[PDB]
Design a protein around this ligand. Structure first.
Ligand SMILES: *P(=O)(O)OC[C@@H]1CC[C@H](n2ccc(N)nc2=O)O1
Ligand SMILES: *O[C@H]1CCO[C@@H]1COP(*)(=O)O
Ligand SMILES: [Ca+2]
Ligand SMILES: [Ca+2]
Length: 903
DNA sequence: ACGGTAAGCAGTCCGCGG
DNA sequence: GCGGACTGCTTAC
């Protein structure tokens, strides 16, 4: 096994590094690192080193890191470039590890913890930590154990020991239903006072110190709470022992009337799961409680308990510890599914950065390009300052809102990284500029070729074709990796189901799994000898091809993530390599590209069909276009169309054998027109959509920009046995529209696309009649609640207050007094409802925290003055009206043909 | 501090008004 | 008094 780093930090002139060594042991070393930076120099005095612009550079070596920083400061105050890596950690890692780091994650301590704090007044603020910590569960990946510390005596009660035996037992008999596979894994530890508990915990931490610290909301609550709790009782020095180097920073807080803040524990790497999830789920949640994320991710229910949680330790201690145990486990279950931690680790070791820097695409990419440039003795630019000037982006086809019966979309492959490569965009490849004509003029091939010699973008930028550019080179390196490991992940399943069918063959002679690598596709040398194997080494030949299928997935996905994260880096002013003109160059080119192929598609289908200037491209957004395929269908007619599968075949055959070639011909001209280095605009078909054959369904409708629905039968050649609704943007896609309403509109949209107007009407008629029976939560609205405390004027609202904040502050005024009632948290979400006329509240609406049931004390009331008539019209009818107006349908008989006008 | 474009909504504004 | 414009905040592609 080879060496790799665990964590790294700069403290003064020292780098403090934790690492795994030659033999698998973790260690700490302090290195009084001597860094290098670079300055320009005469031609003559040329070295081995050059900047990316190809300019000769003198290497300066510094006694310490402070001296380096003092030099950058001196060079600034002069006005000369100070080149090289100014994050000396990235330089430390780059020097210490010149090679593909290969981590073994079983050697990395990843801690998973949660704490409980009984608090009879407010939510317990972690910056004051004024209430005792009465339970901690701490799971340790090296040990594979849940370490439970349980306070038995506290100001808020004395309670007997938790029992594991009772905890393992079922729901229906006073048991907790702590799952069977972890029960044998819990190390229970009771305490008669809080100082003893905290002291033992600090000791534990000393000997089992996390490299990677995770959990749920652990960064904004748990870590600062224990830190501050310990600090408040023991002193700063004691609480510093949470850091393996006894250094912490307490970062400048956000105050208005509360008081809250984040602690940095040097030498630990904190990935809060709530943050890994908000980064890597790409699905927006109505609430962000662990409670609500589990029922979503894992399909495990409520975490039941009679009575409020502040009386939970007192009333039911046994379930209290158990729930804190299940809390830790539930993260661990999500990470088994999601593999977010391993993703982060895989990213961070590829880039050679602190694992916690995966939350930054700028730092990840900075590091990747730095390593790549170093290994060729090149020198990175001084990261300069730039004014946050807004450039223009992807303009969007404004669609005629309407029904659209037959639709097939096509998609540009990784548009933006493809553009950088094709045009060869990079700081140092800028060649000059040209007279730019209006964009329509390029899109239309009217303006003259921008250049015979350089590679151009319609914003005016020219680039060298003869170089090939720091940035394009780097993306290309990653694309080819993303295709390398795709042959080692989709080949790790070729090794699985081929050992999965050899499992028929059992055992009669002792064996051990064969020594040939999984990063290759097997042949015939071991073909009849994976058969004559035993059925115990067949189980071990399934540990490994499954552990490349995951690593090959996790690594490649990390490349896909790397590829799409770049543009964001490139357009961001803090990026070493940003350049406004290049960014604009990228977008402006995309926009051209997308409208170019628009005109190319419309030109083509008009010649094929025998027709002049009729629109086929009904919409376009950034990388896709959506073509109306009605006239393609109607050029054969419903007939000799056997069944639904028959016309979809037709459209699949048509796009692949005819359209796609013309698109290709179209983009090649565009390449020649702009004289790009390389043609990389690869547009092939995405979705095929329409109504079931022989039906009254409408297949699709657009409402406006970014708001549409399609009945899809095929996605990239994967034909569905049942049609999939591709709704993009409508209320059923929104986190703020109620659930029961999210359902109804989906069923409405389904009925429109697949069945009659008759069936839409039958359903609308019924959802109305059954509305009052619905669950008050399933029919409540949702919004983020930002700046509550701006419109908050003596309990009431002042000038310009939103609806959602109105609700927040008629709540604040209803619960004024009752402490065991949740107070809306600013930045978090709120569930909203409307109240009617002479209500006992004061204003029109009421909003309470999302995820939750409203305090018992007003829940019964709010189920009397609830405005369902306004709530039905607001959340259901208004949006339905939108769809049907667009689709040219009615949801109700008797509807007038006039209106939809103005007279 | 670690990309633009655009929706739909509820509040208010603005100019034009017996 | 009137209704379209513009603002402010969400949350979408
Ligand atoms: P839509 O009709 O699904 O098309 C999606 C396109 C792709 C780029 C652009 N987009 C989507 C999502 C985010 N977050 N940012 C974007 O620019 O819309
Ligand atoms: O514009 C920002 C937000 C999304 O892309 C960039 C990310 O840069 P940073 O490294 O978070
Ligand atoms: Ca798309
Ligand atoms: Ca594709």
């Amino acid at each position: 096994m080879k060496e790799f780093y665990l964590t790294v930090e700069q403290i003064g002139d020292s780098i403090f590094e934790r690492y795994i060594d030659s033999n698998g042991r973790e260690r700490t070393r302090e290195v009084e690192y001597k860094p290098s930076l670079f300055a320009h120099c005469p031609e003559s005095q040329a070295t081995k080193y050059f900047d990316i612009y190809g300019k000769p550079c003198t290497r300066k070596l510094f006694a310490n890191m402070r001296d380096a920083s003092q030099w950058i400061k001196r060079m600034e105050d002069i006005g000369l470039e100070a080149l090289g890596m100014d994050d000396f950690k990235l330089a430390y890692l780059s020097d210490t590890y010149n090679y593909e780091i290969k981590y073994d994650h079983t050697k990395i301590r990843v801690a998973n913890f949660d704490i409980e704090v009984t608090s009879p007044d407010g939510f317990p603020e972690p910056s004051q930590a004024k209430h005792p910590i009465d339970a901690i569960t701490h799971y340790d990946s090296i040990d594979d154990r849940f370490y439970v510390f349980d306070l038995l005596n506290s100001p808020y009660g004395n309670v007997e020991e938790w029992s594991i035996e009772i905890a393992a037992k079922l729901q229906e008999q006073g048991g907790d239903e702590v799952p069977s596979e972890i029960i044998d894994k819990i190390i229970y530890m009771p305490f008669d006072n809080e100082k003893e508990l905290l002291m033992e915990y600090l000791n534990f931490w000393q000997q089992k110190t996390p490299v990677i610290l995770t959990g749920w909301n652990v960064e904004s609550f748990a870590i600062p709470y224990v830190y501050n709790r310990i600090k408040n009782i023991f002193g700063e020095s004691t609480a510093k022992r949470l850091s393996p180097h006894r250094k912490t920073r307490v970062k400048v807080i956000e105050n208005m009337y509360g008081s809250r803040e984040i602690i940095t524990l040097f030498g630990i790497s904190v990935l809060d799961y709530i943050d890994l999830y908000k980064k890597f789920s790409f699905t927006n949640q109505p609430s962000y409680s662990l409670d609500y994320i589990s029922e979503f991710e894992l399909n495990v229910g409520k975490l039941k308990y009679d009575g409020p949680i502040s009386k939970l330790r007192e009333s039911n201690h046994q379930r209290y510890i158990s729930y804190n145990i299940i809390a830790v486990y539930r993260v661990l279950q999500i990470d088994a599914k999601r593999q977010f931690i391993n993703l982060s680790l895989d990213m961070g070791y590829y880039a050679k950065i602190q694992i916690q820097s995966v939350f930054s695409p700028i730092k990840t990419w900075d590091a990747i390009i730095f390593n790549s440039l170093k290994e060729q003795n090149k020198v990175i630019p001084q990261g300069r300052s730039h004014p946050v000037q807004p450039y223009p982006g992807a303009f969007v086809k404004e669609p005629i809102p309407n029904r659209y019966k037959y639709v097939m979309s096509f998609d540009l492959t990784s548009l933006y990284p493809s553009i950088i490569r094709q045009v060869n965009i990079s700081p140092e490849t800028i060649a000059g500029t040209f007279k730019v004509a209006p964009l329509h003029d390029y899109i239309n091939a009217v303006a003259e070729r921008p250049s015979d010699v350089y590679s151009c973008s319609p914003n005016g930028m020219m680039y060298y074709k003869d170089r090939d550019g720091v940035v394009p080179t780097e993306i290309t390196k990653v694309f080819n990796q993303r295709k390398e490991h795709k042959g080692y992940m989709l080949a790790a399943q070729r090794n699985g189901e081929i050992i999965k069918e050899a499992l028929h063959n059992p055992n009669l002679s002792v064996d051990e799994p064969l020594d040939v690598d999984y990063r290759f596709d097997f042949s015939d040398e071991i073909k009849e000898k994976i058969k004559k194997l035993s059925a115990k080494s067949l189980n071990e030949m399934l540990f490994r091809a499954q552990r490349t299928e995951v690593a090959g997935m996790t690594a490649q996905i990390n490349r896909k993530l790397l590829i799409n994260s770049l543009y964001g880096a490139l357009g961001n002013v803090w990026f070493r390599y940003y350049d406004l003109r290049n960014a604009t160059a990228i977008t402006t080119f995309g926009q051209m590209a997308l409208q170019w192929i628009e005109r190319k598609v419309n030109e083509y289908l008009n010649e094929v069909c025998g027709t002049e200037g009729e629109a086929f491209v009904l919409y376009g957004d950034t990388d896709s276009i959506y073509v109306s395929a009605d006239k393609i269908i109607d050029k054969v007619g419903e007939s000799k169309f056997r069944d639904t599968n028959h016309w979809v075949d037709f459209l699949d055959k048509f796009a692949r054998e005819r359209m796609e070639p013309a698109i290709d011909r179209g983009f090649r001209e565009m390449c020649e027109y702009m004289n790009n280095k390389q043609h990389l605009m690869f547009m092939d078909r995405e979705a095929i959509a329409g109504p079931p054959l022989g039906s009254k369904g409408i297949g699709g409708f657009w409402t406006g920009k970014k708001r549409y629905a399609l009945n899809v039968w095929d996605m990239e050649g994967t034909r569905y046995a049942e049609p999939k609704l591709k709704i993009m943007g409508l209320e059923t896609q929104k986190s703020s529209t109620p659930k029961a309403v999210q359902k109804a509109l989906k069923e409405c949209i389904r009925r429109m696309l697949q069945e009659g107007e008759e069936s839409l009407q039958e359903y609308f008629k019924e959802f109305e009649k059954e509305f009052r029976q619905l669950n008050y939560i399933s029919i409540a609205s949702v919004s983020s609640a930002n700046n509550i405390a701006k419109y908050d004027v003596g309990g009431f609202p002042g000038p310009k207050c939103p609806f959602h904040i109105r609700g927040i502050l008629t709540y604040n005024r209803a619960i004024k007094g009752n402490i065991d009632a949740p107070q809306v948290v600013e930045g978090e979400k709120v569930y909203v409802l409307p109240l009617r006329e002479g209500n006992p509240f004061g204003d029109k609406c009421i909003a309470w925290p999302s995820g939750t049931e409203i305090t018992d004390l007003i829940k019964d009331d709010v189920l009397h003055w609830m405005d369902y008539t306004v709530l039905l019209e607001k959340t259901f009818i208004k949006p339905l009206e939108g769809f049907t107006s667009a689709a040219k349908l009615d949801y109700e008989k008797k509807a007038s043909l006039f209106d939809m006008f103005d007279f």
